[PDB]
Design a protein around this motif. Structure first.
Motif, PDB file in Angstrom:
ATOM      1  N   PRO A 159       0.827  -1.222   0.000  1.00  0.00           N
ATOM      2  CA  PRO A 159       0.000   0.000   0.000  1.00  0.00           C
ATOM      3  C   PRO A 159       0.853   1.260   0.000  1.00  0.00           C
ATOM      4  N   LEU A 160       1.650   1.424  -1.051  1.00  0.00           N
ATOM      5  CA  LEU A 160       2.587   2.535  -1.166  1.00  0.00           C
ATOM      6  C   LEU A 160       2.099   3.573  -2.168  1.00  0.00           C
ATOM      7  N   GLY A 161       2.616   4.790  -2.011  1.00  0.00           N
ATOM      8  CA  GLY A 161       2.366   5.827  -2.994  1.00  0.00           C
ATOM      9  C   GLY A 161       0.903   6.213  -2.998  1.00  0.00           C
ATOM     10  N   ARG A 162       0.255   6.088  -4.158  1.00  0.00           N
ATOM     11  CA  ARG A 162      -1.163   6.422  -4.234  1.00  0.00           C
ATOM     12  C   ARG A 162      -2.042   5.415  -3.492  1.00  0.00           C
ATOM     13  N   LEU A 163      -1.467   4.336  -2.967  1.00  0.00           N
ATOM     14  CA  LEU A 163      -2.219   3.320  -2.255  1.00  0.00           C
ATOM     15  C   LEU A 163      -2.261   3.548  -0.749  1.00  0.00           C
ATOM     16  N   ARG A 164      -1.386   4.393  -0.206  1.00  0.00           N
ATOM     17  CA  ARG A 164      -1.415   4.658   1.227  1.00  0.00           C
ATOM     18  C   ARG A 164      -2.781   5.210   1.640  1.00  0.00           C
ATOM     19  N   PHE A 165      -3.268   4.755   2.803  1.00  0.00           N
ATOM     20  CA  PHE A 165      -4.585   5.047   3.387  1.00  0.00           C
ATOM     21  C   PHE A 165      -5.739   4.395   2.640  1.00  0.00           C
ATOM     22  N   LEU A 179      -0.550  19.410  11.974  1.00  0.00           N
ATOM     23  CA  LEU A 179       0.795  19.106  12.440  1.00  0.00           C
ATOM     24  C   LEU A 179       1.717  18.639  11.316  1.00  0.00           C
ATOM     25  N   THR A 180       1.197  18.410  10.115  1.00  0.00           N
ATOM     26  CA  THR A 180       2.002  18.097   8.943  1.00  0.00           C
ATOM     27  C   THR A 180       1.945  19.209   7.897  1.00  0.00           C
ATOM     28  N   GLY A 181       1.380  20.363   8.245  1.00  0.00           N
ATOM     29  CA  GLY A 181       1.225  21.443   7.283  1.00  0.00           C
ATOM     30  C   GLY A 181       0.408  21.082   6.069  1.00  0.00           C
ATOM     31  N   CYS A 182      -0.442  20.062   6.176  1.00  0.00           N
ATOM     32  CA  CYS A 182      -1.224  19.545   5.060  1.00  0.00           C
ATOM     33  C   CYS A 182      -2.673  19.988   5.089  1.00  0.00           C
ATOM     34  N   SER A 183      -3.028  20.931   5.952  1.00  0.00           N
ATOM     35  CA  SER A 183      -4.415  21.371   6.022  1.00  0.00           C
ATOM     36  C   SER A 183      -4.810  22.071   4.726  1.00  0.00           C
ATOM     37  N   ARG A 184      -5.630  21.392   3.935  1.00  0.00           N
ATOM     38  CA  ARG A 184      -6.336  21.954   2.796  1.00  0.00           C
ATOM     39  C   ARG A 184      -7.825  22.012   3.121  1.00  0.00           C
ATOM     40  N   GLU A 185      -8.592  22.654   2.243  1.00  0.00           N
ATOM     41  CA  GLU A 185     -10.041  22.547   2.374  1.00  0.00           C
ATOM     42  C   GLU A 185     -10.599  21.388   1.556  1.00  0.00           C
ATOM     43  N   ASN A 186     -10.105  21.196   0.330  1.00  0.00           N
ATOM     44  CA  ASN A 186     -10.336  19.957  -0.402  1.00  0.00           C
ATOM     45  C   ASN A 186      -9.788  18.796   0.415  1.00  0.00           C
ATOM     46  N   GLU A 187     -10.666  18.050   1.086  1.00  0.00           N
ATOM     47  CA  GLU A 187     -10.192  17.018   2.003  1.00  0.00           C
ATOM     48  C   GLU A 187      -9.406  15.927   1.284  1.00  0.00           C
ATOM     49  N   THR A 188      -9.634  15.744  -0.019  1.00  0.00           N
ATOM     50  CA  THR A 188      -8.787  14.843  -0.791  1.00  0.00           C
ATOM     51  C   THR A 188      -7.404  15.442  -1.012  1.00  0.00           C
ATOM     52  N   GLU A 189      -7.335  16.768  -1.174  1.00  0.00           N
ATOM     53  CA  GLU A 189      -6.042  17.443  -1.249  1.00  0.00           C
ATOM     54  C   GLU A 189      -5.250  17.251   0.040  1.00  0.00           C
ATOM     55  N   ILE A 231      -5.378  14.494   1.860  1.00  0.00           N
ATOM     56  CA  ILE A 231      -4.859  13.132   1.773  1.00  0.00           C
ATOM     57  C   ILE A 231      -3.694  13.070   0.794  1.00  0.00           C
ATOM     58  N   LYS A 232      -3.864  13.646  -0.408  1.00  0.00           N
ATOM     59  CA  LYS A 232      -2.748  13.662  -1.353  1.00  0.00           C
ATOM     60  C   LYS A 232      -1.529  14.339  -0.738  1.00  0.00           C
ATOM     61  N   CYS A 233      -1.763  15.354   0.098  1.00  0.00           N
ATOM     62  CA  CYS A 233      -0.670  16.012   0.799  1.00  0.00           C
ATOM     63  C   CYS A 233      -0.049  15.103   1.851  1.00  0.00           C
ATOM     64  N   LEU A 234      -0.889  14.420   2.635  1.00  0.00           N
ATOM     65  CA  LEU A 234      -0.394  13.456   3.602  1.00  0.00           C
ATOM     66  C   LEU A 234       0.305  12.287   2.933  1.00  0.00           C
ATOM     67  N   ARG A 235       0.002  12.032   1.659  1.00  0.00           N
ATOM     68  CA  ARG A 235       0.612  10.904   0.968  1.00  0.00           C
ATOM     69  C   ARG A 235       2.073  11.165   0.615  1.00  0.00           C
ATOM     70  N   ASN A 236       2.468  12.425   0.439  1.00  0.00           N
ATOM     71  CA  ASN A 236       3.864  12.693   0.129  1.00  0.00           C
ATOM     72  C   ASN A 236       4.689  13.057   1.354  1.00  0.00           C
ATOM     73  N   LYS A 237       4.071  13.174   2.524  1.00  0.00           N
ATOM     74  CA  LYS A 237       4.847  13.095   3.749  1.00  0.00           C
ATOM     75  C   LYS A 237       5.353  11.667   3.946  1.00  0.00           C
ATOM     76  N   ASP A 238       6.427  11.542   4.704  1.00  0.00           N
ATOM     77  CA  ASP A 238       7.118  10.273   4.853  1.00  0.00           C
ATOM     78  C   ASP A 238       6.704   9.576   6.148  1.00  0.00           C
ATOM     79  N   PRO A 239       6.781   8.238   6.200  1.00  0.00           N
ATOM     80  CA  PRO A 239       6.242   7.508   7.354  1.00  0.00           C
ATOM     81  C   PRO A 239       6.610   8.103   8.702  1.00  0.00           C
ATOM     82  N   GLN A 240       7.882   8.463   8.910  1.00  0.00           N
ATOM     83  CA  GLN A 240       8.291   8.909  10.239  1.00  0.00           C
ATOM     84  C   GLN A 240       7.689  10.263  10.588  1.00  0.00           C
TER      85      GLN A 240
END
Ligand code: JU5
Ligand SMILES: *[C@@H]1O[C@H](CO[C@@H]2O[C@@H](C)[C@@H](O)[C@@H](O)[C@@H]2O)[C@@H](O[C@@H]2O[C@H](CO)[C@@H](O)[C@H](O)[C@H]2NC(C)=O)[C@H](O)[C@H]1NC(C)=O
Ligand SMILES: *[C@@H]1O[C@H](CO[C@@H]2O[C@@H](C)[C@@H](O)[C@@H](O)[C@@H]2O)[C@@H](O[C@@H]2O[C@H](CO)[C@@H](O)[C@H](O)[C@H]2NC(C)=O)[C@H](O)[C@H]1NC(C)=O
Ligand SMILES: *[C@@H]1O[C@H](CO[C@@H]2O[C@@H](C)[C@@H](O)[C@@H](O)[C@@H]2O)[C@@H](O)[C@H](O)[C@H]1NC(C)=O
Ligand code: NAG
Ligand code: NAG
Ligand code: NAG
Length: 526
Positions: A34-40, A246-256, A258-267
């Protein structure tokens, strides 16, 4: 020693166990990484391969924070992952008896750990003894924990919630399509699990998608109706947003988001999970199961209350000292390195740590109900009281309530109370029969005369192993051969349960009745 599965052949390895042989398949993939576009996302179907897949090593564990509170201490470190962390962790393990069986019952293990931690490769989840001694097949899977496994934007396939549950479900279905090739009976599959794994098992009883994937169920120290086991849709959303900020990923498009959280790294995700709740406890489950509308179609208490679940036998139990393990992870005056005699005011402070959002009156009602000493003098009184509070509220009472409600719909249920303290238990004696220390007896580790267990532990583990197996094969956890105490069904009237220890196997009635009436009826009001 090579097996053809529906997606390819896999090579196993042979183990020698008790003058005999078990065949082990460690690290079979069962989903697309479940990597890349598959995370979450829900796990995706695994695409066929032409090689021999080498299933000879435990695979990667799913990403997780680890317990660093006692570096070098085996009591805590035995639960940390013993395999590389990676997002590429959707693998499972199969132990098959040798010679290859012909229609073996399958035991599927779901590990626990608050839905944020855990891994199937742990030493105390080793399935080779069960396969050897009772000639069942043992299966265990890794499933995504924490936010990577349970982050929820309900309705949104980019982050729908309950992914770790769907990982488990995908593995259950792999057993349906493939275990016959290994000599197993897909019509004779018993889920068993402990803690969050037990709670996972209980949600598989409520999930219609899982009803056809298993026969029976075993729940050790856990169930969904535990206060830690299900995140509200309220908490879930306020928690993914807190993660997002806490990841600076707050968008209003809630899918945006997730896509933002997807390019943050596991740690970076892992480091921020800890702070999405304003006040945490040693029992916090920042990211767990939710009513997603998919795996879980309604609040599970309603489904339990109104009979909406798979009709089958269950085996449920708890340990005598479920709560003690959590006391040395935040409660004042407690330490694994002394006898942790605490005062009244320390006890009260402890409640504020375990019940932070509970009113002053709620916290007094706990103190009132648990501080009525038969002996006012005992210096341990408040130490034991706090463990009993934590254990009854979080484990023993929800387990009993789950079993009462489930058996009221006509199915045989069996309840146990595990009260043997491991002779190898690294934690101090005052912590007693701790959370998670029946697992080694269930898996049959005391059967190995080499590793420092007593005679009496061998005998008890041998009986538990026989009873778990008879429950799995036959739906009835009796040891019929050696004039053992018969294990009665648990009915909501008599509420008979079986105690497990080395000395005496007694039938008793109405475990912790007075404590559970407080937790299950009064306390939910406050
Ligand atoms: C800070 C962290 N300390 C841990 C590990 N440990 C500490 C206290 C005891 C407890 C037991 N334990 C490991 C043993 N085995 C049975 C899985 C868990 O995994 C675990 C974690 C969270 C839970 C929340 C609610 C209910 C049960 C829970 C169990 C946790 C990790 S982060
Ligand atoms: C709902 O969300 C807010 C935001 O949580 C805060 O910010 C997060 C990123 C994380 O760092 C949390 O620890 C923070 O608490 C929460 O509102 C905060 O509440 C606490 C006290 O209860 C405090 O930090 C601030 O007063 C609040 N901050 C803001 C910006 O309002 C709130 O607790 C969350 N949960 C619930 C149930 O309301
Ligand atoms: C049991 O030990 C606890 C844990 O604190 C200890 O502090 C270290 C310096 C070391 O001695 C370790 O054993 C422990 O980690 C004690 O709690 C402490 O109590 C003292 C006095 O009340 C206080 O200064 C500290 O704040 C406490 N630490 C806490 C609450 O984390 C406790 O007193 C000991 N109890 C007995 C009966 O010996
Ligand atoms: C898979 O493994 C094949 C054979 O490995 C055998 O098992 C291990 C435990 C060793 O004892 C090894 O010497 C054995 O022969 C390999 O021939 C093959 O290349 C491997 N394939 C991959 C993709 O790694
Ligand atoms: C295994 O048992 C099932 C019933 O549980 C039966 O229908 C099936 O034919 C058996 N398969 C064998 C013996 O290979
Ligand atoms: C932005 O949100 C809309 C719905 O509000 C969605 O259809 C769209 O796909 C989102 N943008 C991207 C780039 O996905
Ligand atoms: C039953 O008793 C025999 C000794 O007569 C012992 O060897 C065996 O392991 C016992 N079996 C179980 C399931 O307890």
């Amino acid at each position: 020693i090579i097996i053809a599965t529906k997606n390819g052949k896999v090579r196993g390895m042979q183990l020698t166990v008790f003058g005999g042989t078990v065949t082990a398949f460690l690290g079979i993939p069962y989903a697309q990484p479940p990597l890349g576009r598959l995370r979450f996302k829900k796990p995706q179907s695994l695409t066929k391969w032409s090689d021999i897949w080498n299933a000879t090593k435990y695979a990667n564990s799913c990403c997780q924070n680890i317990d660093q509170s006692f570096p070098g201490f085996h009591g805590s470190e035995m639960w940390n992952p013993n395999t590389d962390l990676s997002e590429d962790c959707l693998y499972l393990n199969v132990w098959i008896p040798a010679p290859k069986p012909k229609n073996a019952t399958v035991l599927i293990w779901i590990y626990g750990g608050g839905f944020q931690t855990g891994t199937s490769s742990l030493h105390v989840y080793d399935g080779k003894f069960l396969a050897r001694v009772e000639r069942v097949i043992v299966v265990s899977m890794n499933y995504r924990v924490g936010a990577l496994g349970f982050l929820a934007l309900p309705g949104n396939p980019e982050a729908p919630g309950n992914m770790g549950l769907f990982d488990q479900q995908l593995a259950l279905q792999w057993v349906q399509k493939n275990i016959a090739a290994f000599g197993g009976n897909p019509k004779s599959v018993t889920l068993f699990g402990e803690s969050a794994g037990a709670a996972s098992v209980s949600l598989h009883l409520l999930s219609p998608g899982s009803h056809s994937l298993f026969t029976r169920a075993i729940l050790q120290s856990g169930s969904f109706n535990a206060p830690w086991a299900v995140t509200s849709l309220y908490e879930a959303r306020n928690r993914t947003l807190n993660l997002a900020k806490l990841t600076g990923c707050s968008r209003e498009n809630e899918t945006e988001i997730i896509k933002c959280l997807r390019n943050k790294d596991p740690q970076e995700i892992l480091l921020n999970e800890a702070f999405v709740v304003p006040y945490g406890t040693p029992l916090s489950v920042n990211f767990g199961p939710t009513v997603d509308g998919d795996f879980l179609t309604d609040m599970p208490d309603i489904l339990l209350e109104l009979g909406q679940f798979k009709k089958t036998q269950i085996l449920v139990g708890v340990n005598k000292d479920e709560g003690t393990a959590f006391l040395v992870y935040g409660a004042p005056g407690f330490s694994k390195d002394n006898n942790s005699i605490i005062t009244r005011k320390e006890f009260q402070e402890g409640l504020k740590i375990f019940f932070p959002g509970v009113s002053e009156f709620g916290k007094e009602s706990i103190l009132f109900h648990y501080t009525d000493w038969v002996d006012d003098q005992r210096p341990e009184n408040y130490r034991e009281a706090l463990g009993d509070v934590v254990g009854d509220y979080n484990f023993i009472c929800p387990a009993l309530e789950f079993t009462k409600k489930f058996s009221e719909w006509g199915n045989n249920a069996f309840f146990y109370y595990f009260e043997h303290r491991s002779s190898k238990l690294p934690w101090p004696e005052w912590m007693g029969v701790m959370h998670g220390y029946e697992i080694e007896f269930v898996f049959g580790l005391p059967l190995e005369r080499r590793d420092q267990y007593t005679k009496a532990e061998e005998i008890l583990s041998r009986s538990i192993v026989k009873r778990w197996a008879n429950f799995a094969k036959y739906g009835n956890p009796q040891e019929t051969q050696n004039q053992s105490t018969s294990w009665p069904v648990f009915k909501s009237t008599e509420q008979k349960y079986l105690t497990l220890n080395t000395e005496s196997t007694r039938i008793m009635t109405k475990l912790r009745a007075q404590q559970c009436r407080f937790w299950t009826s009064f306390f939910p009001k406050v």
